[PDB]
Design a protein around this ligand. Sequence first.
Ligand SMILES: O=C(O)[C@@H]1CCC[C@@H]1c1cccc2[nH]ncc12
Length: 169
Amino acid sequence: SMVNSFSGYLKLTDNVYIKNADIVEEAKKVKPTVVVNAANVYLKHGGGVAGALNKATNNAMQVESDDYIATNGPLKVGGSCVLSGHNLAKHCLHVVGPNVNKGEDIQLLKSAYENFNQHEVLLAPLLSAGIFGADPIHSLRVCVDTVRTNVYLAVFDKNLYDKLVSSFL
Ligand SMILES: O=C(O)[C@@H]1CCC[C@@H]1c1cccc2[nH]ncc12
């Protein structure tokens, strides 16, 4: 009964909010209906956000994900799937942003964010940021220009959070 209890976010637009927070700790506190994972097409949750979310589930997310890939095959870059949220959320929306460190087309970042519009409210990281190699300022731009549903962005590093907020407007 205290689900989606987001607290302390700064409003960027009518529907995009941001906080300097650890997304795993935020998921455990606010009990969101949906937490977004920064996934790859094989749902191999090794590093960055995906490795942290999987570790918090004691590898249950990876076991479920490997079964999903055995049944369905890999996702597309820009695509997503809904799986269990385990101890983090009702659901995990695994979204595949382009990985610039693999030379993937940054133009697929808009298609990746469009997955968010299928959910009324989400706790999310910035897609294609961090270990995926895209400029986080650009990822925030594409997020605010694409997502229309209510998205709560968790940015771990205070210094990156300050750069994103300070430069947004
Ligand atoms: O080699 C990698 O980068 C990892 C290791 C496990 C397989 C995975 C992978 C293979 C091919 C394409 C990929 N795109 N995002 C991940 C990915």
